[PDB]
Design a protein around this ligand. Sequence first.
Ligand SMILES: *[C@@H]1O[C@H](CO)[C@@H](O[C@@H]2O[C@H](CO)[C@@H](O)[C@H](O)[C@H]2NC(C)=O)[C@H](O)[C@H]1NC(C)=O
Ligand SMILES: *[C@@H]1O[C@H](CO)[C@@H](O[C@@H]2O[C@H](CO)[C@@H](O)[C@H](O)[C@H]2NC(C)=O)[C@H](O)[C@H]1NC(C)=O
Ligand SMILES: *[C@@H]1O[C@H](CO)[C@@H](O[C@@H]2O[C@H](CO)[C@@H](O)[C@H](O)[C@H]2NC(C)=O)[C@H](O)[C@H]1NC(C)=O
Ligand SMILES: *[C@@H]1O[C@H](CO)[C@@H](O)[C@H](O)[C@H]1NC(C)=O
Ligand SMILES: *[C@@H]1O[C@H](CO)[C@@H](O)[C@H](O)[C@H]1NC(C)=O
Ligand SMILES: *[C@@H]1O[C@H](CO)[C@@H](O)[C@H](O)[C@H]1NC(C)=O
Ligand SMILES: *[C@@H]1O[C@H](CO)[C@@H](O)[C@H](O)[C@H]1NC(C)=O
Ligand SMILES: *[C@@H]1O[C@H](CO)[C@@H](O)[C@H](O)[C@H]1NC(C)=O
Ligand SMILES: *[C@@H]1O[C@H](CO)[C@@H](O)[C@H](O)[C@H]1NC(C)=O
Ligand SMILES: *[C@@H]1O[C@H](CO)[C@@H](O)[C@H](O)[C@H]1NC(C)=O
Ligand SMILES: *[C@@H]1O[C@H](CO)[C@@H](O)[C@H](O)[C@H]1NC(C)=O
Ligand SMILES: *[C@@H]1O[C@H](CO)[C@@H](O)[C@H](O)[C@H]1NC(C)=O
Ligand SMILES: *[C@@H]1O[C@H](CO)[C@@H](O)[C@H](O)[C@H]1NC(C)=O
Lengths: 413, 99, 367, 49, 206
Amino acid sequence: CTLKSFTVEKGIYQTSNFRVQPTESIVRFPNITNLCPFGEVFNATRFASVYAWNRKRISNCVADYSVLYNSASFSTFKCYGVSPTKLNDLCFTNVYADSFVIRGDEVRQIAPGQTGKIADYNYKLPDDFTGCVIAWNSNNLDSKVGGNYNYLYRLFRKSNLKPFERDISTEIYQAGSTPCNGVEGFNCYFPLQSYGFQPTYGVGYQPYRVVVLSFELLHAPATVCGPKKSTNLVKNKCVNFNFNGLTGTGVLTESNKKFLPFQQFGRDIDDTTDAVRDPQTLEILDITPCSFGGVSVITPGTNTSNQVAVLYQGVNCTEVNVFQTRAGCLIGAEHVNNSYECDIPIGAGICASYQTSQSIIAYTMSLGAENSVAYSNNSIAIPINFTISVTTEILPVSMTKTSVDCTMYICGD
Amino acid sequence: IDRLITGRLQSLQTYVTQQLIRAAEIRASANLAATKMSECVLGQSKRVDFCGKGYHLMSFPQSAPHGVVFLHVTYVPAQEKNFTTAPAICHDGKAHFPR
Amino acid sequence: STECSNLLLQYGSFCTQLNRALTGIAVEQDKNTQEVFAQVKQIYKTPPIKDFGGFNFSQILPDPSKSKRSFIEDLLFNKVTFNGLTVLPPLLTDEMIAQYTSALLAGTITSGWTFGAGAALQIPFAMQMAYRFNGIGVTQNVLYENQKLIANQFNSAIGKIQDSLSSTASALGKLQDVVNQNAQALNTLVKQLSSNFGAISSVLNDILARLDKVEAEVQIDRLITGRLQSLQTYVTQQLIRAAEIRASANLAATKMSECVLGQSKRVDFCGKGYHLMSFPQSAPHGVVFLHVTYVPAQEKNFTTAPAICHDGKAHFPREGVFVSNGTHWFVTQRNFYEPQIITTHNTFVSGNCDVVIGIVNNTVYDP
Amino acid sequence: STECSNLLLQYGSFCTQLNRALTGIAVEQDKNTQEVFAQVKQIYKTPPI
Amino acid sequence: AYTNSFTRGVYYPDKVFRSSVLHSTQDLFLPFFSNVTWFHNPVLPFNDGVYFASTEKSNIIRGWIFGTTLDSKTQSLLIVNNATNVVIKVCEFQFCNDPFLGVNCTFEYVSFKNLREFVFKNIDGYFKIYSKHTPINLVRDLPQGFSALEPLVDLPIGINITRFQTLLAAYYVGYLQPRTFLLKYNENGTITDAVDCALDPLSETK
Ligand SMILES: *[C@@H]1O[C@H](CO)[C@@H](O[C@@H]2O[C@H](CO)[C@@H](O)[C@H](O)[C@H]2NC(C)=O)[C@H](O)[C@H]1NC(C)=O
Ligand SMILES: *[C@@H]1O[C@H](CO)[C@@H](O[C@@H]2O[C@H](CO)[C@@H](O)[C@H](O)[C@H]2NC(C)=O)[C@H](O)[C@H]1NC(C)=O
Ligand SMILES: *[C@@H]1O[C@H](CO)[C@@H](O[C@@H]2O[C@H](CO)[C@@H](O)[C@H](O)[C@H]2NC(C)=O)[C@H](O)[C@H]1NC(C)=O
Ligand SMILES: *[C@@H]1O[C@H](CO)[C@@H](O)[C@H](O)[C@H]1NC(C)=O
Ligand SMILES: *[C@@H]1O[C@H](CO)[C@@H](O)[C@H](O)[C@H]1NC(C)=O
Ligand SMILES: *[C@@H]1O[C@H](CO)[C@@H](O)[C@H](O)[C@H]1NC(C)=O
Ligand SMILES: *[C@@H]1O[C@H](CO)[C@@H](O)[C@H](O)[C@H]1NC(C)=O
Ligand SMILES: *[C@@H]1O[C@H](CO)[C@@H](O)[C@H](O)[C@H]1NC(C)=O
Ligand SMILES: *[C@@H]1O[C@H](CO)[C@@H](O)[C@H](O)[C@H]1NC(C)=O
Ligand SMILES: *[C@@H]1O[C@H](CO)[C@@H](O)[C@H](O)[C@H]1NC(C)=O
Ligand SMILES: *[C@@H]1O[C@H](CO)[C@@H](O)[C@H](O)[C@H]1NC(C)=O
Ligand SMILES: *[C@@H]1O[C@H](CO)[C@@H](O)[C@H](O)[C@H]1NC(C)=O
Ligand SMILES: *[C@@H]1O[C@H](CO)[C@@H](O)[C@H](O)[C@H]1NC(C)=O
């Protein structure tokens, strides 16, 4: 198939390339540290009134969402613009967590482009939000006997809030046809009002704690990321690998190199990365490439036999009758103790031939018969007779004259 | 079409470059065959191994498609025998050397 | 990257014709090496006792304590010094090349020009030099009368080769240049993997992480285009560089035949002076010839004439030229002053005196 | 042009190895000329007669 | 006042080990044999980046301030040794017009006989610090010799910088330029000599 023929003449032909494939994948990153303190967002004893909603900004930190989505604690968990399963792979310039208390019936207002007293007067999300919403019943935390009138929401406003607009202005609202003079009156009202939460109420009037998570990315650096996972480390085998950002594939091994305390990678003269520091245990590993080379088929020609030998050029038989030549691992040829003229050349003094039920044999080539010339101080050899000899010599003198019209080769007609 | 022009033009430049390099290899062989014809066929070369092995007597050209064949005729000494030898001989006190 | 490999298929035969080209260059290097060194039919070897007329080859013959290289070949082997890349071994090892230079040298020393023309016919080295002198038109007695002087001048001249080669690496500049150009070409070929070629990054896994499939494919095709142009440039440059080495191996194979295996009449082909013989030594990726030549070194002026008159006949020299010390006329060989009396054996008659422009009146002795 | 020069650096070594190839051919012409003519050691003169 | 830089102010350009090799790099470097400004504080430009050094034995110089305004309207770096170790903040400070120590917070962090040398540069929103501490035998000027500056910190903060000032006695200021240098790495992977390729025709040849 390589030669596009059903007959093959005597020779050595490269039919393929061999390459040791990676046995497994390694990933290494630093010890998981500076985990963000989500207990300030979700587990604080205090919580905010919804008009004055308390925002946390997270920066220069690693934020796990898997603790948030795996926890059974939440009466609702939702996400917009992002898959909840994908969150832990992402990085952002900032992450925001917005926290407040509302009645259980009104939690549905905390959604993209939605409307109502909580949405339009307290906390608003855009028609294309990127983020998540998390909520739980807080009746034992935020209700009190006699009514916890200390929690507040804006019942009245002049106009709807913009997306993410925060507003703690005390502006008195005029519903009637007569002005307020800066105080309540007939159809004039103070804007902030209470549910009066009690433990006995039905679930729609019981308080819920609510958290909204929002994500931001800029040309300003990605200061927040999800946690980074790592595997065990495997030495002395061909492996796919990733150390920090550096992907590669090679045989990782222990090394004598002494990097300075700030250095993380080592390079060859030809830029090629040739050592790495493991970020968890600070050892220096050499990288050496997984074994590769041409595969050649040695054949006495399909006229004489269907036997072949295979040479894996530069490969060692550990990586792949079987015989280790200095040219590479040779398979199917019998090693022979004699020597002959070179029939099919292999390399580094080795040749192969088909010889005595016959088989392929591989041997060190013979340069000629040895001859100690019978030299002496006072003796000469003179020829008594001759042969006239005729020697054929062939020389090529010309190619077949060819022209190619490039205007027609590139684009005929 | 500009992807096809870009690929077919690079394909043809690759061929023309390797044919220019191969034409120089064939010219170097035609300059050698022209030299073997002047020195071996039209003459008798003293140049060792130029016109075959052994001491060269003459050679003959035969044509072949895209080439030439020389039949180099040479003298090879065949049945050697050992003798004792000397650089000179003394006669009447004077050294004689072979002419 | 299997994603890149599936785009590289759209370029068709290109990766096959680059390997077919470099395989032709690699297979040619063993033909170059074979045509220089493998000119000997049998592996000749030297007699045990070194009675070569007082000439001393000990520094160019094998040393069995060392590979079996000569003392000079061990100077020559000291003074020259995986992104899919591979280096293949030569077919003939450096030990096999040293066996061929040993066979060529032991045949040359023990049998002269004869081993290039049939069987090696042994001849004493003092007589081999006599026929190499007689081949440059210096009469063979000029060797045997000066044999100790000539042997000491040869033994001394080989000593200066050892000193010259011991003193500097800049002796072997042509071989170190061939090594340096192949390293410069490969470091260039690998450093070109660091280039963007207009893509968003030089690293495929960075492209594949930043971009969705249809955009990543366009950035990868810029790296494929630039890396394929980078490899075609290397293969073209190696094909041109190999053609220069083939022209040099054809010349080294011609100096093996015409100039080690023979004696050359060709002026300044086998070093300056009238050539006597030369000796091959192996070197890393090359051959070194020690060309031995007769150089005339002190001269004196003489009055001269094209013919002499005798009994009205004009006499011309058979071999040589007529010269006078000022009072007497002699005939000498041309390349060394040995004057002989003018006789009917040293000279030949042709015609009367009156034709020749500048003939002189003298006497021919008839024995 | 500075705008083009900054784009050409993204093609890496190509431009340096073209200058190096033409510089090697230029230096060879002075070698070719000295292989032919500079074979004589001394500047010989003919006599006035 | 002014002094010669000599060969001072080279730093390791990347976190890569290289050994027994010469490497050619283009980066913001202080040019060899350039002028550096000498002082015994003013607000100073930042340009492409700053080399800073001082000769000390008594801790007269405590830290630095960096920003666009260097005052209140927008965020600004405040970097100070608290006499235990380095402290860093980036707030929109409304601090003094002659700031000293005695002889909003989007990020915050905690870490003559001496010449202390530093390099500050700000690229794609990361603020880089390099340094070296070394002995000396002269007070008036930077000592002629070579020793490369190693990295300290690498801060993702995104803040624009065009001016700086030094918190208070001999110190030196020089401005980085986009230059090509050839760097010599020894067997242990330290930079041990360098060539400023634009300096003179012999350096271009090297
Ligand atoms: C990353 O964490 C590991 C595990 O704690 C640290 O390695 C050592 O682990 C052994 C237990 O197997 C402890 O007894 C040692 O005290 C740990 N430390 C050292 C210095 O040996 C490892 O050092 C950590 N790496 C970083 C960069 O923090
Ligand atoms: C011919 O030239 C040679 C140069 O080698 C001369 O030989 C040297 O002669 C001196 C005495 O003058 C000896 O000490 C040396 O040992 C000789 N050299 C060697 C290699 O042995 C020689 O004398 C000259 N002869 C004439 C007639 O001029
Ligand atoms: C050398 O000697 C011959 C023989 O004596 C000279 O021959 C001349 O022969 C003619 C014959 O008619 C005489 O008339 C002359 O008298 C002879 N010459 C002399 C000088 O006597 C021949 O000329 C002489 N050649 C030279 C170069 O001196
Ligand atoms: C809240 O507190 C409990 C008890 O300390 C802890 O197990 C849980 O992980 C915390 N959850 C969050 C969301 O912080
Ligand atoms: C082949 O590999 C094995 C295992 O590393 C080693 O023992 C052997 O020496 C190698 N031989 C060659 C010629 O590479
Ligand atoms: C070749 O001969 C040697 C003699 O010592 C022996 O060690 C070796 O096994 C032989 N190999 C073969 C293939 O016969
Ligand atoms: C010449 O003589 C030697 C010693 O007797 C012998 O070894 C050698 O074979 C002889 N050669 C020929 C061609 O007869
Ligand atoms: C030849 O010269 C060497 C020194 O180069 C010397 O040791 C040796 O004795 C000389 N003679 C012979 C016959 O080797
Ligand atoms: C030979 O003759 C010329 C001209 O008289 C003279 O210059 C030269 O010195 C003479 N001697 C030798 C040894 O050439
Ligand atoms: C040399 O020149 C002289 C002077 O012109 C002349 O007399 C003589 O015949 C010439 N001799 C030869 C050998 O040409
Ligand atoms: C710059 O260097 C020169 C000496 O080369 C010096 O005279 C001058 O004061 C320095 N400062 C300025 C700003 O020119
Ligand atoms: C500050 O840096 C940002 C980087 O995106 C840039 O948009 C802005 O123009 C810069 N402002 C100044 C005054 O440099
Ligand atoms: C390099 O490190 C070795 C210890 O591995 C140390 O002996 C040597 O002094 C260091 N410095 C140099 C310049 O080699």
